[PDB]
Amino acid sequence: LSPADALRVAEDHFLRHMPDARDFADVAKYLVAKGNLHLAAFNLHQAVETAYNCYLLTLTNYSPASHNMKFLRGLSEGRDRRLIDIWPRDRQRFTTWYNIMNEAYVKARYSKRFEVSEEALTWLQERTAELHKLVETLCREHIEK
Amino acid sequence: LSPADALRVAEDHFLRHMPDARDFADVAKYLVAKGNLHLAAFNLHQAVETAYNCYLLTLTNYSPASHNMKFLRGLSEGRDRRLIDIWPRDRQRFTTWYNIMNEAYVKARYSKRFEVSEEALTWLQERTAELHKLVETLCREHIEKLEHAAG
């Protein structure tokens, strides 16, 4: 509630959180190089969650505090339709793969098995990189002057 | 219940989890090089949690499923006193620093402020590396490779 404050606060959010998101995606790449695909999916999950958190905070000064994936994605696509392109459902395997990441937070550290191919991970990386590019753009476009 | 099964299962656990723990500690180093100290603390928290989870699974085929830190540490030190050396309280800053990591799972991704110095992180890295060395050793020492003598 105040033109100059609202700018300060939206800059603070975006600078605080977008770099966490980029870094999680980098950690994932690192872990793929290591051969630890399950923990890379976990980092991809975090890259994506953090990216949405960053989006919602920057543009509305609020984020759920569950930080639920479906929820934060829901809310974010609800605030700007351009974000739906990120996760196309024109092939089934795209949902299989996406669900692997979603399962990865809860499982992945803890389950005895957690199956994810190289191909799935390459796809989730491409998709995360577009989410990050777009989210970065949409956050800059929110410039109060 | 079964000498050869119990060995298979304890190897499976340790091989499944110890490498997650090492890898979290490595990720932390990587993030320290990147200048992202808050997320490195987060990975350190996971390196430690995963290490204790690995310990308790290997030796007892069970782990809480809270995966609470105080808890899993409590349980793990309760089963082998050697693990108390890992987190000495002979300086106050050691408790400040440890608490930073503990707070790091919950905060750190989410909070606006999360303060952790280079010195703190270096100390948490050294400590995590001893936990991992010790845990690795205690897991190998758990060998029912003898108790399947009765073949």
Author numbering:
A (entry chain A): 151 to 295
B (entry chain B): 151 to 301
Describing publication, verbatim:
Two additional proteins, among others, are also required for Agrobacterium tumorigenesis: VirD4-coupling protein (CP) and VirD2-binding protein (VBP). VBP is responsible for recruiting VirD2–T-DNA to VirD4 CP to help localize T-DNA to the Type IV Secretion System apparatus for transfer. Sequence-based predictions revealed that VBP has two domains: an NT_KNTase -like domain at the N-terminus and a HEPN (higher eukaryotes and prokaryotes nucleotide-binding) domain at the C-terminus. We show that the C-terminal domain is the dimerization domain of VBP and only dimeric VBP is functional and essential for the induction of tumor in plants.
Subsequently, we generated a new construct that consisted of the C-terminal domain, and obtained crystals that diffracted up to 2.7 Å resolution. The structure was determined using the single wavelength anomalous diffraction (SAD) method.The asymmetric unit consists of two monomers forming a tight dimer. Each monomer contains a six-helix bundle with three long anti-parallel α helices (α1, α2, and α6) that forms the major part of this domain, and three shorter helices (α3, α4 and α5) that stack at an angle to the long helices. The monomers are arranged as anti-parallel dimers with a large buried surface area of 1203 Å2 (or 14% of the total surface area of each monomer). The dimer is held together by tight interactions between α1 and α2 helices from both monomers. This residue, along with Lys184 and Asp173 of one monomer, is involved in hydrogen bonding contacts with Asp173 and Asn186, Lys184 of the second monomer. We found that a single substitution of Asp173Asn, Lys184Asp or Asn186Asp in the HEPN domain is sufficient to disrupt dimer formation, as verified by size-exclusion chromatography and analytical ultracentrifugation experiments. The structural similarity observed between the HEPN domain of VBP and kanamycin nucleotidyltransferase, as well as the results from our ITC experiments, suggest that a nucleotide binding pocket is formed by the dimeric interface in this protein.
